[PDB]
Amino acid sequence: MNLTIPFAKGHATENDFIIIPDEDARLDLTPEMVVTLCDRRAGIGADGILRVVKAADVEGSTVDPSLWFMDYRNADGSLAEMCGNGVRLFAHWLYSRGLVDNTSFDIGTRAGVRHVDILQADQHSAQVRVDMGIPDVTGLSTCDINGQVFAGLGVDMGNPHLACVVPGLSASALADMELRAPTFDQEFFPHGVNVEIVTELEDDAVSMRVWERGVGETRSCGTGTVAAACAALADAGLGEGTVKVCVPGGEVEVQIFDDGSTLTGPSAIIALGEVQIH
Amino acid sequence: MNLTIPFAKGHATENDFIIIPDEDARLDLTPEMVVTLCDRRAGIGADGILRVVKAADVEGSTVDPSLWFMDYRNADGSLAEMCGNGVRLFAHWLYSRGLVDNTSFDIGTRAGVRHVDILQADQHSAQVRVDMGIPDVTGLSTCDINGQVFAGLGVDMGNPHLACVVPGLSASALADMELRAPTFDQEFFPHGVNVEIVTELEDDAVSMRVWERGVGETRSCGTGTVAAACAALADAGLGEGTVKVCVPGGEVEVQIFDDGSTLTGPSAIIALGEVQIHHH
């Protein structure tokens, strides 16, 4: 059985997803089908798949069963918890297709309920704000990238980060760096770490590159932008504030409070079609 | 004003394309539009665009104006095609959509008229044979990859190749090899070359990997597979023959005649849809 599946392609700061509508919970999307669809040259190509289903139809969903549930799969076929960027696209999809009736709403995920606000949306483009939780600064550590040692802050955003504000780092020197997989303290980070290399806060903005664990450099890491803003604010003596974070895939704005944080950024829905697998 | 464009996505041995129907030649597809569409994370993503248009309506075409013309664009916008896989997919589209009424036909291209035969097709899949022209064997040479020297045969198929057939190298060993950008004799190749590393003929088959010039390793290179077949034949003391070539993107069959060559291989059309873009 080769199967034809209606889909949409989109991205959120160029962290890209295939959206699969399945409002009646009819599709059994297997790991193998995930991989096949996300293969960029043989399939459609993406970082992952966002299946659109009600929380009622996801077994083990902890959340209110009337909510839409972001059934997120990584491109390698694994189940994934949550995605700071993919939530924006999922929210954009729900709102722009009239599946929710308010600009402010919740979405279910395997990591719990996520609250979103649509600031602007049409069928192609949106600006979405997501609640990202209290950043938890777990300590002070270092990594080594290609012989050069960087100091950072451990930040727990639900997943582990080492966010390294580099004194003296310009946006051009950042773009010109060669990145390789970092070496780090494996006692501090026993399950691996996402490393952000970040400029100092200047006119309420910074730039970042990120080496995501198990993946390598990416266009954008949503949780990583919050970590980076956390570290930028720390390095400037501030415990709270608003930071524009520039990543290779675009720009986002992070707000850090005492008791929470938000990530605001774009969402784009690029194509609609039908794909045949298998 | 924004434009909604019907497209299809397909590939031929995993050299992938966005096909854009434009039978009435209404779309001005600019190089920047190509780059946007072919960006794998921000767009649809592909190695290139195949625009479906009559030769009459393509600027600078002077082939028979009544042919369909593979208006091929590389993902950076450029017009020159190197590997030739696009032709299979183009043929498959044209046949399966009823735009031609024979399994044997000609297609207009920037590199001249190409002759194809559809051996089988449906809406989704096809096996297509393409006339690839007379390989121009340019002679023995070498390259170094990652400290190892390899002999191979130079073949110009429109662009330069060095196909290095490696006695003793198994298919497994070939897959485990760690490729890097080859160094080569710059006198023989003063502007670089596409390098194939190929196993020796066994059961009329070889395995190949390919480092394409200024690209790096790719899944497939149609012209590369023809050079590989020429090289595998020469490695066995032969000038002519039929060779199955296994690349990471799948399997093709090359035939080398004393006066020409063909490449037969798969095509897949995997999706249909619409994409919105700004008019330029």
Residue numbers in the entry:
A (entry chain A): 1 to 278
B (entry chain B): 1 to 280
What does the study report here?
DapF (EC 5.1.1.7), a pyridoxal 5-phosphate-independent amino acid racemase, catalyzes the stereochemical inversion between l,l-DAP and d,l-DAP.
In one monomer, two catalytic cysteine residues (Cys83 and Cys221) were oxidized, forming a disulfide bond with each other; in contrast, these residues were reduced in the other monomer. In contrast, in the oxidized form of CgDapF, the loop was positioned 5.8 Å closer to the substrate binding site, compared to the reduced form, resulting in closure of the substrate binding site. In contrast, in the oxidized form of CgDapF, the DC-loop interacts with the CTD instead. The disulfide bond between Cys83 and Cys221 is the main contributor to the stability of the loop, and the side chain of Thr223 forms hydrogen bonds with the main chain portions of Met82 and Cys83. Under oxidized condition, the position of the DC-loop occludes the active site, which inactivates the enzyme.
